[PDB]
């Protein structure tokens, strides 16, 4: 059994738990979700490096005052304290948190825990970063 | 009707991947020089 | 004795690298200088079972005022090479970070990651100022 199907098996079980009919990876090995119609999360399977990537949209750059990218970089210096680091998508204008799961520890329990944590922080920086008040 | 799920106190819907919407030569260590400081 | 393991690997590595000896200091850190241009700073976190590698790239005094945007953007794609850009406020120099868990903490994995880290560190030094 290849890695792709191993993960597809995990996403099928995860779907059954939350109430979605089905859930699988793309031909590119991708799958996206939308939480509370606000936080978008994308799953990225890297079969080569055997690891699952998790992208999370935090906030839009239009609501952010400048000088924040510096405070985000200062965060990445201690990313190991949360296993999460910041990134940016120029095309979308969205600030993103990234989390990864090694194929060796990739289980349902670990996947849900890593996702819930990623969302916990994403929602936090989504409510904190904006300066528009 | 659009399917809606629930995860840790959050609603969840299937989202599009929108892949089209939004987006080295290894050098051995034996050759590299070292300087403990 | 998780600290002695790293000292054991740093000991065996010390022979292969050419250095007389190598071990973590009282704090649990270590500083090394490669090619006289690249500098890596080992850092062992006991309770977390992690080995951090901080590689100085370039100071911010030669970059523009719109460089912080770029770094964040780079981290999106460098998320594949298991690397990312950060910054030390006190020092004042952008850095590349990488970590090795106690589970995969082997001599082979140590040199492989460090080899990859040095290549990317050098690669960026030349390109950052532009």
Curated annotation (Swiss-Prot), chain B:
Disruption phenotype: Deletion mutant deregulates expression of the type III secretion genes. It comes from the Bacteria. It is found in: Cytoplasm; Secreted. Coiled coil: none annotated. Acts as a negative regulator of the type III secretion regulon (T3SS) expression. In the absence of inducing signals such as low Ca(2+) or host cell contact, the T3SS/injectisome is expressed at a low basal level and exists in a quiescent state due to ExsA sequestration by ExsD. ExsE binding to ExsC disrupts the complex between ExsC and ExsD, thereby allowing free ExsD to bind ExsA. Upon inducing signal, ExsE is secreted allowing ExsC to bind ExsD. In turn, ExsD cannot bind ExsA and prevent ExsA-mediated transcriptional activation of the type III secretion system. Interacts with ExsC. This is Type III secretion regulatory protein ExsE. The chain holds residues 17 to 81 of 81 of the full protein.
From Swiss-Prot, chain C:
CDD domains: T3SC_IA_ExsC-like. In the absence of inducing signals, ExsE interacts with and inhibits ExsC activity. Its main location: cytoplasm. GO terms for cellular component: cytoplasm. GO terms for biological process: positive regulation of DNA-templated transcription; protein secretion by the type III secretion system. Disruption phenotype: Deletion mutant results in a two to three-fold reduction in extracellular exoenzyme S activity representing the efficiency of type III secretion system (T3SS). Mutant also demonstrates a lag in the induction of cytotoxicity towards Chinese hamster ovary cells and is attenuated for virulence in a mouse pneumonia model. Keywords: Cytoplasm. It holds the Pfam family CesT. Part of the regulatory cascade that plays a role in the transcriptional regulation of the type III secretion system (T3SS). Interacts with antiactivator ExsD to inhibit its activity leading to ExsA-mediated transcription. Homodimer. Interacts with ExsE. Interacts directly with ExsD to form a heterotetrameric complex. This is Transcriptional anti-antiactivator ExsC. It comes from Pseudomonas aeruginosa (strain ATCC 15692 / DSM 22644 / CIP 104116 / JCM 14847 / LMG 12228 / 1C / PRS 101 / PAO1). The gene is exsC.
């Amino acid at each position: 059994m290849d890695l792709t199907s191993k993960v597809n098996r995990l996403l099928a079980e995860f779907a059954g738990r939350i109430g979605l009919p089905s859930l699988s990876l793309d031909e590119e090995g991708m799958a996206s979700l939308l939480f509370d119609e606000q936080v978008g999360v994308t799953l990225l399977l890297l079969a080569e490096r055997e690891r699952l990537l998790l992208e999370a949209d935090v906030v839009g750059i239009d609501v952010l005052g400048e000088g924040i990218f510096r405070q985000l970089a200062s965060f990445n210096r201690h990313w190991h304290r949360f296993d999460l680091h910041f990134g940016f998508d120029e095309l979308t204008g969205k600030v993103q948190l990234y989390a990864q799961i090694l194929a060796a520890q990739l289980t349902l329990e670990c996947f849900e825990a890593t996702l819930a944590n990623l969302l916990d922080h994403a929602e936090f920086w989504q409510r904190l970063l904006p300066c528009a008040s | 009707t659009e399917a809606v799920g629930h995860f840790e106190g959050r609603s969840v819907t299937r989202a599009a991947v929108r892949g089209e919407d939004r987006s080295g030569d290894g050098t051995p260590l034996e050759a590299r020089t070292v300087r403990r400081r």
